[PDB]
Amino acid sequence: MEVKEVELELSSEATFLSKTSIGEITAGEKGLNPMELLLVSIGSCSGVDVYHILKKKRQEVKDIKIFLKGKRREKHPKIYEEIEIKYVAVGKVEEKALEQAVKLSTEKYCSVLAMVKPSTNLKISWEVKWEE
């Protein structure tokens, strides 16, 4: 069971210098938004799975763009009632390969998404931009 550790300390009012094993960022009221960072966590987690699965399936990836949109509820805790995630793969990629990669990532591999799925409605879509 691998262990992940991060440490935060105030850098300014309600704002934290956040230290991870390989880099620091500023998050809080006067830094990056915590809920936006959650979408970044989800997106990169899944994006990494997708990139690896596509390469394993021997597809030629020129780029992968991921768009995430979270709709927050009105009452506290203001969680995302739903998150829309759109994956776009550019290069020589079969749409069925992208489909399998996205399904494996969202249903099995991406850990961040697995942790939030029970609390939100996910709306996933994908498409390929064929290019030599």
Place this chain on the structure above:
Amino acid sequence: MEVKEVELELSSEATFLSKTSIGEITAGEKGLNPMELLLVSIGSCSGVDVYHILKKKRQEVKDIKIFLKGKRREKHPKIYEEIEIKYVAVGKVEEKALEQAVKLSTEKYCSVLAMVKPSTNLKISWEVKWEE
């Protein structure tokens, strides 16, 4: 229902330039770790609540340090089976104030934590370092 939107694009192999409304960071295999970013999201989300509640309770905050440790399970999806969060408030802060702030944040206010609680075991502790 406020909406949060982020956009990711490859910056290198399995690594994404991640754009939020107010800043960009690099996440993925050759960037910040997605699961570590999740802990940062949780920590800053909660930390912001704590800072605001303490100020509202008229406490004198010199600093707030937050330590997060996530123990990942062995099987896919490798989610955090548990997350330990330790809050340390420095300055003129009553321990009961910190206690209420932490409980309100973890049970009501922090949205990120609310989304993951159903999937993990949280172990929360707090302490005050009294200082003039």
